Amino acid sequence: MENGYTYEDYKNTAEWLLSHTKHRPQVAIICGSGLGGLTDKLTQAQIFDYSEIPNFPRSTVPGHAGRLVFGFLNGRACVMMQGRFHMYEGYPLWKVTFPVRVFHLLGVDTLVVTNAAGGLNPKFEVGDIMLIRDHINLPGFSGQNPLRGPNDERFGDRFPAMSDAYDRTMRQRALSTWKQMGEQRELQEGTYVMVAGPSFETVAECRVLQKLGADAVGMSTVPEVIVARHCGLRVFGFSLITNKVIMDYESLEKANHEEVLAAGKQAAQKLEQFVSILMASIPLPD
Amino acid sequence: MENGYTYEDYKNTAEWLLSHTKHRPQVAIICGSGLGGLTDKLTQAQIFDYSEIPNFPRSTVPGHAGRLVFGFLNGRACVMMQGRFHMYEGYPLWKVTFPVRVFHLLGVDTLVVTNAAGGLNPKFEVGDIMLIRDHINLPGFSGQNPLRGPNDERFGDRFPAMSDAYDRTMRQRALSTWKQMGEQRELQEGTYVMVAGPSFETVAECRVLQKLGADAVGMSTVPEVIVARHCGLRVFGFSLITNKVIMDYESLEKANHEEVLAAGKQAAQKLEQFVSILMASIPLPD
Amino acid sequence: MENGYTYEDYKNTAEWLLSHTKHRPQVAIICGSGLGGLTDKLTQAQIFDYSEIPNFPRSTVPGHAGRLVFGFLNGRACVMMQGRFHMYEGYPLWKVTFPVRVFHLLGVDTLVVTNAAGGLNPKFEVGDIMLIRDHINLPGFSGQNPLRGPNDERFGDRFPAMSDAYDRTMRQRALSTWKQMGEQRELQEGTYVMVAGPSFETVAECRVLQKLGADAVGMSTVPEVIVARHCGLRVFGFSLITNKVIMDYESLEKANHEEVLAAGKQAAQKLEQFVSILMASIPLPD
Ligand SMILES: O=c1[nH]cnc2c(C[N@@H+]3C[C@@H](CO)[C@H](O)C3)c[nH]c12
Ligand SMILES: O=c1[nH]cnc2c(C[N@@H+]3C[C@@H](CO)[C@H](O)C3)c[nH]c12
Ligand SMILES: O=c1[nH]cnc2c(C[N@@H+]3C[C@@H](CO)[C@H](O)C3)c[nH]c12
Structure with missing residues (x-):
């Protein structure tokens, strides 16, 4: 197997975007789940549908793939x-x-990644926000790693380290921002395990993931982080705990997408505020 | 990647079978290992080789793939x-x-799945039958999940839950049937872990699987269960413990297919009886 | 999926090599990392670039793939x-x-495999040599097993056992050779876990692998061993511990390829000596 994209392809997509917007972003934000509304806080916002951009992955209905939104969020030039x-x-x-x-290749130097996740740590509660200190890449142990294939030294090394993936400094700076917001629940922190899904975990599977030392489980993020770290980006991320994974056979409750989207809706304002203030704490470049 | 089958394909295969048999099954039984002989107890039996059926997966020698056998087993309209x-x-x-x-799409509402499995729980013995209370889908954690790809709402949801996969009621009803048979060994119950194989586990691997909380290990079943649950089927299943996985380096014994097939042969009558009586306990539809 | 190689292909590659060298090897040695120099100790050495050999996997630049070197190492007819x-x-x-x-198919009966590995056992030290007593095949649990696909009985069984993969006798005979060398550090022994890589493990991942009971982690070897065992070869192998995996968040050190290659260089002489003497301990055929 090999990455279907050549270096030329990535450069071509970047050149295209560079030609179609005057915006020059420093921070990329992947808006996870129930945090899409964050683009409503950008100023000078310029939207590009993924369908218009050369080389972007395609969805069957081209529009459901989504959009890149360039703009300014609380001082920082962003692309979300x-x-x-x-x-x-x-x-x-x-x-x-x-x-x-x-x-x-657009010149971004920082990646913020967010997601919704199932809570494995028994102390977490729906609505909780968990900053990501580390991850367990289960698909990557088996060969599903985004760097599989010939390496291109123009992006990075053959064997990049991941032990320092999550910027120590901005997890510190985010603990600050949280007190400034004056929040009841404390800011959680822990390990995110990626599983592929799309079906939800069984009880026996949840117990496995808890014993691996994971605090939250989701179906994304890890690969983006690996590729970010590989090309030099600073990374910060967090998960909204939208549900507490079922851990015992007596329970008659089940994980479900409606409940995940509901929690997303509730924590919407809290999240957009949280991320907007934090922009000020991202170092300027140079 | 995507599922090579369109909704039309599944419908076409179902329509074909619906046109070639008057049998209308309610219960599907996947006969696992040393339980094929169970088709000898069907009445009004109509056999279809997989090679004849449109869209069925193909084996090199078309006949070695197997056959669908429609009939009646102790009162229930089955397809095995x-x-x-x-x-x-x-x-x-x-x-x-x-x-x-x-x-x-044939109208089946219940899936019974059986298999042979290696015993990880140290109390299990060759010949033991373990009902499946839960599973650990190791391939699925990495991306090998049968639902990977675009979802079709005609079968089910994008993110189905699996915590309730194994019908509580019929594990209860099967504990009954077992006493009615008057058996020496008790009916075992536990967690089935799927690994891909085809080679057998090492000692260090067996210890891993034991510490994940698995009781039995095999190379099948989980995916069928996930797809069953996804389209609404009730599921019950069990494993015949055909061998006790080697757990220490001193042992001079090794897992082997001959010994697995042998255990299959011994437990043959016990199994066919067990499954036949249980049919009466599967609820009627409606 | 299926293995792209037919039995004819393997036979054709073997016949070709058999026609282009008079050497008839008994022992195959896969030289792992910083042990390539071992070919400098062969006598009567005949080199074949992988690019020349029919059916050999190809590297973009054909030469960077490497070479097969046939010769005699301390008495034994080898192919490295x-x-x-x-x-x-x-x-x-x-x-x-x-x-x-x-x-x-060349008539080799023994496979020696070596590699560099990250130390998970906290007692190991850079420079340590760990003999491999067992392995944990994480990719294989998910479906990445070299035997996946139709089985060819000409090489072996559908379901080969792996619990006895690492020849008990030559781990014993290697403990000997080590005292004969008169070494300060003791010869380590333990379990090798394969992960796919290519990125290095996170802290949370290292803790997982330690709790699985692994002593060393690398990105190779397991598949070759599985295929070796499957066709009847005797197998012995070891890892050079080139680094101690980062296990806590305070550490400011990171795994890196330079440091891995450095450790390789240091342990070079020790390794080539170690393997050369050991040849004498491999049984003669017949
Ligand atoms: O319990 C969980 N297990 C695994 N993933 C999630 C997530 C992350 N979700 C997974 C998926 C279902 O809402 C959507 O892509 C975002 C929330 N809760 C859980
Ligand atoms: O020890 C075991 N490990 C993994 N699978 C099995 C099975 C299930 N087998 C696996 C395979 C070998 O008989 C056949 O497809 C049914 C029995 N024993 C073991
Ligand atoms: O810390 C580690 N983790 C995983 N693999 C290795 C290895 C084996 N390496 C992995 C790779 C990087 O040097 C090369 O193919 C040989 C050494 N140290 C580690």
Whole structure:
């Protein structure tokens, strides 16, 4: 197998965007789940549907793939993805992560990634926000790693390290912002495990993931982080705990998408505020 | 990637079978290992070789794939698969599970799945029968999930839950049937872990699987269950423990297919009886 | 999916080599990392670039793939691979392991495999040599097993056992050779876990692998061993611990390829000596 994209392809997509907007972003934000509305806070906003952009992964109905929104968020020149690609949809990881390498060639230096996740840590509660300190890449252990294939030194090394993936400094700076918001619940912090999905975990599977030392489980993010780190980006991310994974056989409740989207809706304002203030804490370049 | 089968394909296979038999099955039974002989107890039996049926996964020698046998088992209108597809044979999971979606469109409402499995729980003994209370889908954590790809709402939801996969009621009703048979060994119950195989586990691997909380290990079943649950089927299943996985380096014994097939032969009568009586306990439809 | 190679292909590659060298090897050595120099100790050495050999997996620049070197090492007729294929490079496992089946048809009866590995056992130290007593095949649990696909009985069984993969006798005989060398550090022994890579593990991932009972982690070897065992070869192998995997968040150190290659260089002489003496301990055939 190999990444279907040549270096020329990524460059071509970046050149195209560079020619169609005067915006020059520094921060890329992948808006996870129930956080799409964050583009409503950008100023000077210029929207591009993924369907218009050369080389972007395609959805059957071209528009449901989503859009890149360039603008300014609380001082920072941003590009936000509203709509992301998941491997459970059938995309190979070199398509899932194609935009990350584009952001880099646009001059982005920081990637913020967010998602919704199921809570594995028994102390977490629906609505909780968990900052991501580390991840467990289960698909990557098996060969599903976005860097599989010939390496291009123009982006990075053959064997990049991931032990420092999540910027220590901005997890610190985010603990600050949280007190400034004056919040009842404390800001959670922990390990995110990626599983492919799309079906939800069984009880026995949830117990496995808890014993691996994971705090939250979702179906995305890890690959983007790996590709970000590989090309030099600073990374910060968090998960909204939208549900507490079922851990025992007596329970008569089940994980469901409606309940995940509901939690998304509730935590919407909190999240957009949270991310907007944090922009000020991202270092300026140079 | 995507499922090579369109909704039309599944419908076409179901329409074909519906036109070639007057039998209308309610229960699908996937006969696992050393339980093929169960078709000898059907009455009014009509056999179809997989090679004759449109869209069915193909074996090199078309006949070795197996056959669908329609009939009546102790009162219930059944369709049994004698011969199944495994991912270790090279089939993608959307081929492995193609028949499950066909059963559904035939009007089946219940799936019974059986298999042979290696015992991980140290109390299990060769010959033991373990009812399946839950599973650990290791291939699915990595992306090998039969629902990967665009979802079709005609079968089910994008994100189906699996925590309730194994019908509580019929595990209860099966504990009954077992006492009615008056058996020496108790009916075992536990967690089935799927690994792809086809080679057998090492000692270090067996210890891993034991520590994941698995009781039995095999190379099948999970995907069919996921697809069953996804389209609304009730599911019950069990494993014949054909061997006790080697757990220490001193042992000079090794897992082997001859010994697995032997255990299959011994437990043959016990199994066919067990499943036949249980049919009476499957609710009627409506 | 299926193995792209027919039995004829393997036979054709073996016949070709058999026609182009008078050497008839008994022992195959896959030279892992910083152990390529071992070909400098062969006598009567005949080199074949992988690019010249029919059916050999191909590298973009044909020469960077490596070479087969036939010769005599301390008494034994050997064939050594200098350069190997990894799944993180994009090769399917039936390409990674193609040479193993060729060795067999050349008449090889023993496979020695070596590699560099990250230390998970906290007692190991950089420079340590760990003999491999067992392995955990994480990719294989998910379907990435070199035997996936139709089985060819000419090489072996559908379901080969792996619990006895690493020859008990020569791990014993290697403990000997080590004292004969008069070494300060003791010869380590333990479990090798394969992960696909190519990126390095996170802290949370390292803790997972430690709790699986693994002592060393690398990105190769397991598949070759599985295919070796499947066709009847005796197998012995070891890992050079080139680094101690980062296990806590305070550490400011990171795994890196330079440091791995450095450790390789240091342990070079020790390794070539170690393997050369050991040849005398490999049983003669017949
Ligand atoms: O319990 C969970 N298990 C795995 N993933 C999730 C997620 C992340 N979801 C997974 C998927 C279903 O809403 C959507 O792509 C975002 C929330 N809860 C859970
Ligand atoms: O020890 C085991 N490990 C994994 N699978 C099995 C099975 C299930 N088998 C696996 C395979 C070998 O008989 C056949 O497809 C049914 C029995 N014993 C074991
Ligand atoms: O810390 C580690 N994690 C995983 N693999 C390795 C290896 C084996 N390496 C992996 C790769 C990087 O040097 C090369 O193919 C040989 C050494 N150290 C580690």
